[PDB]
Amino acid sequence: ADQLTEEQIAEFKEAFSLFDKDGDGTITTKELGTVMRSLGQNPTEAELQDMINEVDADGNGTIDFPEFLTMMARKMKDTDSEEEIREAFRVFDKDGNGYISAAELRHVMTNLGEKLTDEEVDEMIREADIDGDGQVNYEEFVQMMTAK
């Protein structure tokens, strides 16, 4: 229902640099599972190549930036995309306090192999908290996808 613009396009190319630590425009099989080990799952060689061949345009175990935008905009057109957001909420809000707590958000950042301060966490709240409750809800979370 909602379409992305050149502005939203800059966040994607910018979002691609997290999975593309090489700077060539590829998300290799080993880079995707590195994301899998920080999520709390065991990555297998059968799964790694299986996930890639879904978007992989070349077919060598790497995902490119043109078709990466192809996967998100596809299932985002069924409007039943509410079941997919429940997935982002469980990764952020682990104990389901109904919203996203600062204590759990930190662990997600620290589990990625990085060290951040609480001062930055306040920035996420002003960015997603409408009434400024200090935590992130799913309802606001839904609207956060169409935010520029």
Binding site: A15, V35, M51, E54, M71, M72, A88, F92, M124
Partner: peptide, 17 residues
């Protein structure tokens, strides 16, 4: 949250496949 929100949606669609 705006950038790190798009990264989680991609891993959830490739993991449930």
């Amino acid at each position: 949250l705006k950038v790190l929100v798009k990264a989680v949606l991609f891993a959830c669609m490739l993991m449930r496949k």
